[PDB]
Scaffold this active site. Structure first.
Site, PDB file in Angstrom:
ATOM      1  N   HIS A  45       6.077   5.765  -8.614  1.00 23.64           N
ATOM      2  CA  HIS A  45       5.131   6.722  -9.145  1.00 23.64           C
ATOM      3  C   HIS A  45       3.898   6.848  -8.212  1.00 23.64           C
ATOM      4  O   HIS A  45       3.015   7.662  -8.434  1.00 23.64           O
ATOM      5  CB  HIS A  45       4.738   6.169 -10.487  1.00 23.64           C
ATOM      6  CG  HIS A  45       3.818   7.023 -11.283  1.00 23.64           C
ATOM      7  ND1 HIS A  45       2.922   6.486 -12.178  1.00 23.64           N
ATOM      8  CD2 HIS A  45       3.738   8.369 -11.426  1.00 23.64           C
ATOM      9  CE1 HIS A  45       2.340   7.464 -12.855  1.00 23.64           C
ATOM     10  NE2 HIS A  45       2.821   8.616 -12.417  1.00 23.64           N
ATOM     11  N   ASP A  89      10.888   2.264 -11.479  1.00 23.88           N
ATOM     12  CA  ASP A  89       9.582   2.601 -10.947  1.00 23.88           C
ATOM     13  C   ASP A  89       9.165   1.515  -9.971  1.00 23.88           C
ATOM     14  O   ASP A  89       8.297   0.688 -10.237  1.00 23.88           O
ATOM     15  CB  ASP A  89       8.590   2.784 -12.073  1.00 23.88           C
ATOM     16  CG  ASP A  89       7.301   3.369 -11.600  1.00 23.88           C
ATOM     17  OD1 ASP A  89       7.215   3.723 -10.418  1.00 23.88           O
ATOM     18  OD2 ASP A  89       6.363   3.460 -12.392  1.00 23.88           O
ATOM     19  N   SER A 182      -1.593   1.205 -11.313  1.00 24.32           N
ATOM     20  CA  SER A 182      -0.199   1.413 -11.005  1.00 24.32           C
ATOM     21  C   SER A 182       0.208   0.770  -9.675  1.00 24.32           C
ATOM     22  O   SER A 182      -0.528   0.834  -8.714  1.00 24.32           O
ATOM     23  CB  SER A 182       0.066   2.926 -11.024  1.00 24.32           C
ATOM     24  OG  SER A 182      -0.104   3.355 -12.347  1.00 24.32           O
TER      25      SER A 182
END
EC number: 3.4.21.39
Length: 226
Positions: A45, A89, A182
């Site tokens: 991501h 991810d 993230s």
């Protein structure tokens, strides 16, 4: 990182800060970690047009002699990475050149295919993300201790899967990783077991992390293919 504290400077030498350029509304940023001299692990991501990694930083607004900023020469996104189920991810980044191993800049070991960390454990996560739902990101590295939850704590998340993901953060507390975090790793007893992936827009924990042990062979495939 929500509800945490400022890391002691350089106490987490594997922390990588990623500046990303997208084909649209400018740059965004992500956390990530150095697994080898020319390889950083982050979330899929966090993929973009071009990316730069700053290693050895504390306050990302003031450079220091610890700083090492390298270019990303190639992005190995997980091919099964899906923007819908958000499964897989994970992404590996190859650096144009090798980071110099210093006390401020170091590598972190990821787990084996058979290292299955269970619910209950308290792990730590670090990052430069938002410190609240509508609050700016942090200039300094923050970190929070969080509890791994049983798969059910996260079943509100469509497609949550125990084998591939980690349910992180006690539903009763505020502490959590958030936008900007993230790609940063979850350390459990000194081993990286997860990667901040996603959670709610209202920042209410648990948040979902990628379970790295499961991707071990793939990381391995690329690392050996270089």
């Amino acid at each position: 990182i929500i509800g945490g504290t400022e890391s002691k400077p350089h106490s987490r030498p594997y922390m990588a800060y990623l500046e990303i350029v997208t084909s649209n509304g400018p740059s965004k940023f992500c956390g990530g970690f150095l697994i080898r001299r020319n390889f950083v692990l982050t979330a899929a991501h966090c993929a973009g047009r071009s990316i730069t990694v700053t290693l050895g930083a504390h306050n990302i607004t003031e450079e220091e002699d610890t700083w090492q900023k390298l270019e990303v020469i190639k992005q190995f996104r997980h091919p099964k990475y899906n923007t819908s189920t958000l499964h897989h991810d994970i992404m590996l980044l190859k650096l144009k050149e090798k980071a110099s191993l210093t006390l401020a800049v170091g590598t972190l070991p990821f787990p084996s295919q058979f290292n299955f960390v269970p619910p209950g454990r308290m792990c730590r996560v670090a990052g430069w993300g938002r410190t609240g739902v509508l609050k700016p990101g942090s200039d300094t590295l923050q970190e929070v201790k969080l509890r791994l939850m049983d798969p059910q704590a996260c079943s509100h998340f469509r497609d949550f899967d125990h084998n591939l993901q980690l349910c992180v953060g006690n539903p009763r507390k505020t502490k959590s990783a958030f936008k900007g975090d993230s790609g940063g790793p979850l350390l459990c007893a000194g081993v990286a077991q997860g990667i901040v992936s996603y959670g709610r827009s209202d920042a209410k924990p648990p948040a979902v992390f990628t379970r790295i042990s499961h991707y071990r062979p793939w990381i391995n495939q690329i690392l050996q293919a270089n």
